[PDB]
């Protein structure tokens, strides 16, 4: 009567039952018009007797554990306008008798174990508005031709299913459909041109299929179109100009196709475009200037294409741009200073182009730029002092260019800077002491430059996990303060002019997995403390120095070292200290003064005889039988 969850007809007959969130279990009067048992943690089959409530207009069993088939008897209920079975364990085919529910409006089958094909019978459901069957991994076959008969269709989604073949031309008959979502499925063949007849279409999500052919021109006649996601398919041909005729379109993602041709000038007419992703295609031409008319653009990703020419200056007109990715193209010319007028820019990646000239200082005035990736271009000139103005800079990669002059001291101003790669440039002078002020600096790669001078423990910030100074002119001695960097994992100082002993202070870097001191002027004896860093795992490279004496006995504690290169030194004595290192994959002892015998273990036997020949006394011996 009045009890909670129960509702009554005016004649006093039980009308509706609604039960939710009661954490039950297990399995589960004919005036009843509405039944919701939902989110109850119910198990077992749907009772076959459900078909007996002739007056049911609503059945919601969703958000349970129900198993078994969808009983055919469920389809005896002629007055049913809502069938909600989603989020269960339901298996089997969607029965043909589904076509028997004349006034069905809502059908939710999504997130089940369903299989087989969408029956040809859906065509019979003429009041159907929403059909969502997605998230059934084994729902398979083609979308039937008869789908064109559900004329009231508004929302259709089959996403994350095994649905395959081409979308039927029938689809063009859905004059009311707003959203077609069939994505991350098995779809192949061309998008049918008839899709242009769907005049109410707003969102078309066909991404992550095998769709082939080109993008139909007719899509430019859809005036209500908002989002078009077609990424990661086999799409071919030129981007249709007519797309510039969809006034409501805010999102276009064609990423990861075979598209060729040019970015259409007509895109300038899309006053609502927020997001344009063309990434990973064959698009050629130059970035058209009319694209700078798209005032609301936040995201522009044109990376991995054939685009040529210059980045247009009028790009300053895009005042909402937060993300600009043009990397891996054929872009030439200067990076325009006007790009600094887009004050919202979070990330710029122009890497892998032909860009030349100086880096315009103005770009460093952007207060929200986290990521600046300019790597692999023809850029030259100085790094501007203005680099200090760029307050939120987190990730900076300038590597693989012609940059000249000194690393500007004001880089010390950047307190959020995590990752910096300036490697492969023409940089000169000293690593500036002021860099000690980058509190957040983790990764620092200066390798392959003309950097010179000495190296100070005071100079480096103590949060560094990765240092590569290799291939420079650096000199004097490795500073004792190197021991202050206790986070330091990889340290690569190779191909420098560095001198003196390895300081025992090295021992106190307890995180060090990789140490490359190769190709320097180091001398004296290899310290015992170097064997006290059990974290050494990846590699220890001492080669091409002046080291003398013997391999320190502590080296036996190097139990995690996989690669060791002492080659091209003056080292003497024997190798016995190394015989027990069970994890050592690679040993280069060549061009030393070593002498004595090595056991006949397959390990040592794998050492090149030419490596023993470049020593004093080394040879493999055979043990005596005793």
């Amino acid at each position: 009567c009045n009890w909670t969850g129960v509702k009554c007809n005016r004649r006093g007959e039980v009308s509706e039952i609604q039960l939710k969130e009661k954490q039950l279990q297990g399995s589960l009067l004919k005036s009843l018009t509405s039944l919701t048992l939902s989110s109850l943690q119910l198990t077992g089959v749907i009772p076959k007797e459900i078909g007996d409530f002739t007056e049911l207009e609503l059945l919601d069993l969703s958000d349970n554990s129900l198993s078994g088939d969808i009983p055919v008897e469920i389809f005896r209920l002629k007055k049913l306008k809502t069938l909600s079975l989603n989020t269960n364990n339901l298996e089997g085919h969607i029965p043909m008798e589904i076509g028997n529910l004349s006034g069905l409006v809502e059908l939710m089958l999504f997130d089940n174990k369903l299989s087989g094909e969408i029956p040809r019978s859906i065509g019979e459901l003429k009041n159907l508005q929403v059909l969502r069957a997605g998230g059934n991994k084994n729902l398979r076959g083609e979308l039937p031709w008869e789908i064109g008969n559900c004329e009231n269709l508004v929302m259709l989604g089959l996403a994350e299913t095994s649905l395959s073949g081409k979308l039927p031309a029938s689809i063009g008959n859905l004059k009311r459909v707003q959203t077609i979502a069939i994505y991350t499925s098995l779809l192949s063949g061309p998008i049918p041109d008839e899709i242009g007849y769907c005049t109410e279409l707003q969102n078309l999500y066909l991404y992550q299929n095998s769709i082939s052919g080109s993008i139909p021109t007719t899509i430019g006649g859809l005036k209500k179109l908002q989002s078009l996601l077609l990424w990661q398919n086999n799409l071919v041909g030129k981007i249709p100009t007519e797309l510039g005729n969809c006034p409501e379109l805010w999102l276009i993602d064609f990423s990861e196709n075979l598209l060729t041709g040019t970015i259409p000038r007509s895109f300038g007419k899309l006053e609502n475009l927020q997001e344009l992703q063309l990434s990973v295609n064959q698009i050629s031409g130059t970035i058209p200037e009319e694209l700078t008319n798209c005032t609301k653009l936040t995201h522009l990703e044109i990376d991995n294409n054939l685009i040529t020419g210059e980045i247009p200056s009028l790009m300053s007109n895009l005042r909402s741009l937060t993300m600009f990715f043009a990397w891996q193209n054929k872009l030439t010319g200067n990076i325009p200073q006007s790009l600094s007028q887009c004050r919202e820019l979070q990330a710029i990646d122009l890497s892998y182009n032909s860009l030349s000239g100086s880096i315009p200082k103005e770009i460093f005035g952007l207060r929200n730029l986290t990521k600046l990736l300019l790597l692999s271009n023809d850029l030259s000139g100085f790094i501007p002092p203005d680099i200090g103005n760029c307050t939120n800079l987190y990730r900076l990669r300038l590597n693989g260019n012609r940059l000249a002059g000194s690393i500007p001291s004001e880089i010390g101003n950047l307190k959020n800077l995590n990752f910096v790669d300036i490697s492969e440039n023409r940089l000169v002078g000293s690593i500036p002491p002021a860099i000690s002020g980058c509190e957040s600096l983790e990764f620092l790669d200066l390798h392959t430059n003309s950097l010179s001078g000495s190296l100070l423990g005071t100079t480096l910030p103590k949060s560094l996990k990765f240092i590569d100074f290799s291939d420079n002119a650096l000199s004097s001695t490795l500073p004792p303060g190197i021991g202050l960097l206790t986070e330091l994992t990889k340290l690569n100082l190779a191909k420098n002019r560095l001198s003196g002993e390895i300081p025992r202070e090295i021992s106190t870097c307890r995180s060090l997995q990789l140490l490359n001191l190769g190709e320097n002027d180091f001398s004296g004896e290899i310290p015992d403390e170097l064997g006290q860093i059990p974290s050494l795992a990846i590699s220890l490279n001492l080669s091409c120095n002046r080291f003398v004496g013997e391999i320190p006995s502590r080296f036996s504690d190097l139990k995690n070292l996989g690669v060791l290169d002492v080659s091209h030194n003056q080292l003497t004595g024997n190798l016995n200290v190394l015989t027990d290192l069970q994890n050592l994959v690679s040993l280069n002892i060549s061009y030393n003064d070593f002498s004595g015998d090595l056991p006949n273990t397959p390990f040592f036997r794998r050492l090149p005889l030419s490596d023993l020949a470049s020593n004093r006394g080394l040879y493999i011996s055979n043990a005596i039988s005793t």
Binding site: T87, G134, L229, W231, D253, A347, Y352, L375
Partner: peptide, 13 residues
Amino acid sequence: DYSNPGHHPPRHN
């Protein structure tokens, strides 16, 4: 739940 619709995840260097 099957994923919500999404765009191509952007990649940078």
